[PDB]
Write a protein that binds this ligand. Sequence first.
Ligand code: HKS
Ligand code: HKS
Ligand code: CL
Ligand code: CL
Ligand code: ZN
Ligand code: ZN
Ligand code: ZN
Ligand code: ZN
Lengths: 308, 308
Amino acid sequence: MMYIQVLGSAAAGGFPQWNCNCVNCKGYRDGTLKATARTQSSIALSDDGVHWILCNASPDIRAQLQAFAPMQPARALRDTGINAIVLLDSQIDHTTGLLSLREGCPHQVWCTDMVHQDLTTGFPLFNMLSHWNGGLQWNRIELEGSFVIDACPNLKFTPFPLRSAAPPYSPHRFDPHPGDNLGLMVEDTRTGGKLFYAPGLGQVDEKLLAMMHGADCLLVDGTLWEDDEMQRRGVGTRTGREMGHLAQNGPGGTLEVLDGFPRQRKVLIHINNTNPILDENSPERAEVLRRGVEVAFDGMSIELLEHH
Amino acid sequence: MMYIQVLGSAAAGGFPQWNCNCVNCKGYRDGTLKATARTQSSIALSDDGVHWILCNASPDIRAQLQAFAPMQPARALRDTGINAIVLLDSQIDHTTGLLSLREGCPHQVWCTDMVHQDLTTGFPLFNMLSHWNGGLQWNRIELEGSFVIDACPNLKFTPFPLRSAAPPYSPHRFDPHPGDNLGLMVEDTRTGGKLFYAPGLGQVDEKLLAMMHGADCLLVDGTLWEDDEMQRRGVGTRTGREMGHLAQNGPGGTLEVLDGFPRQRKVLIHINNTNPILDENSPERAEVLRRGVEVAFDGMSIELLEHH
Ligand SMILES: N[C@H](CSc1cc(C[C@H](N)C(=O)O)cc(O)c1O)C(=O)O
Ligand SMILES: N[C@H](CSc1cc(C[C@H](N)C(=O)O)cc(O)c1O)C(=O)O
Ligand SMILES: [Cl-]
Ligand SMILES: [Cl-]
Ligand SMILES: [Zn+2]
Ligand SMILES: [Zn+2]
Ligand SMILES: [Zn+2]
Ligand SMILES: [Zn+2]
């Protein structure tokens, strides 16, 4: 049994976003719209329900840990359910949670060489935190093969590179390298059950679709409904392809890509505050449900039972 | 009229703290104890109720902004009630909130030279954030005299140095300099009303007590009830004087110091998860109330009306 807990399902500045009065965010604050609050994206994995591996540490990590009881097993005066942390990139959105875990160092942190480089220079989390009882102990993620974290010995991680787009603070932001962005294949080796996790997904080649058909659950990038959704909402000009996020709709969007996967469970995660699929009455939400695609929400539990 | 809004009243890792099962934190989670959740310490100041100055940007800033309606005035598609940020030190606990405000740059940030130095080297917030549309625009806090932030032209800030203890990541952590830690005197120049704000207070000389008697409201360090409260709770060994926090109780504690101030409104803020004053039934809470001292809580509004 593989447990997947959605601690956060939003992109970005969460939902609602602190400085945003778009139709979704103002509608949620006004109470005029049927949608649920969401913290920034992060999931937790386990093979036994007691030892958990965090994927990305969002700035909302304090409220996310508190909302999920297994994160506090209460086995000592100081304790946590977090046994390791995996990072998929070095973005601020996906890493600042680590600053809120220093009362509990050391932590095993798994990340590639590129991300480790960002996190010792432009955003030197590893350097800052080594001053708290050992800080973060780096475990390198190699760009080929697999790894296993002792705390969950039945989970086999197989990362796959995505389109390198290093963060704006990165010393190598103009010089993208493989290792900047990862998606994760996760296998319960007791059952063959396979999770495909890609919350940041900019494009889909055919090596990727081959991975995805060997998987039972697809937990994928859903930040934007339209590639120019920021412009459509009046909140900015950056495009989906500029951010490395493939929109749901249109030619080559994730919904059309996902029509090739009727076997798999399909879940959209990492959803931006502008996306109409957050409006539970939107026609965009209704179409997503027609296509057999779920919309992740804070608190969602996904149990991976067996292989199809 | 000076408005003081308590966005967060806790020290530390908030209350409850993510990894703590002390009597307070487990008691709150178990539902066995009468206490209210608290985010990490931060207040917001205003002279008109519309333009707000943030004092310290805690890691909980997203939930704190959302909980206080004037932080979203909804005057445009992107908007915020934050018009400036003042930092009293460079600690991670009091600054990581800035990483969650990058969708809204530029921000005017006021801080001393020492803190600016920390925030461009050991924890380079200013460098990281300058990649988001101008980032943080530094306004130096001088170690003498006063300053005024245009957005609240009737608030006069007069900082006073406290015992220099630079943070553990600081390149100068073993070499403390004046400018590392500030307390704030805040004056409504229309009325003479004066707030004395010192959430981190390690000792009390007589220059300080002279400041405090010219003030109407004392909003002061309340993190620890006893100097060795960590040891008494089983959660660690660092002492109150090691952290630069003067306990409430005992010879020279803040309660004995505050007996000399019966005129002033007195509020304890920045309270650690271990402190029994969070237990609303504790005898420590009852004594605090007897002495005419209030316990700050998330959401507390303090209106400074006039000068005594
Ligand atoms: N610091 C950058 C931020 S880019 C980014 C932007 C958005 C859109 C944003 N929420 C909005 O509505 O104004 C959503 C995201 O998920 C992002 O990641 C990085 O991530 O490198
Ligand atoms: N990163 C350091 C952290 S020291 C600090 C420690 C505590 C005690 C802590 N909460 C606990 O119960 O385990 C409370 C605080 O308010 C602190 O500031 C800094 O602040 O320089
Ligand atoms: Cl980033
Ligand atoms: Cl610190
Ligand atoms: Zn994100
Ligand atoms: Zn919005
Ligand atoms: Zn603090
Ligand atoms: Zn506690």
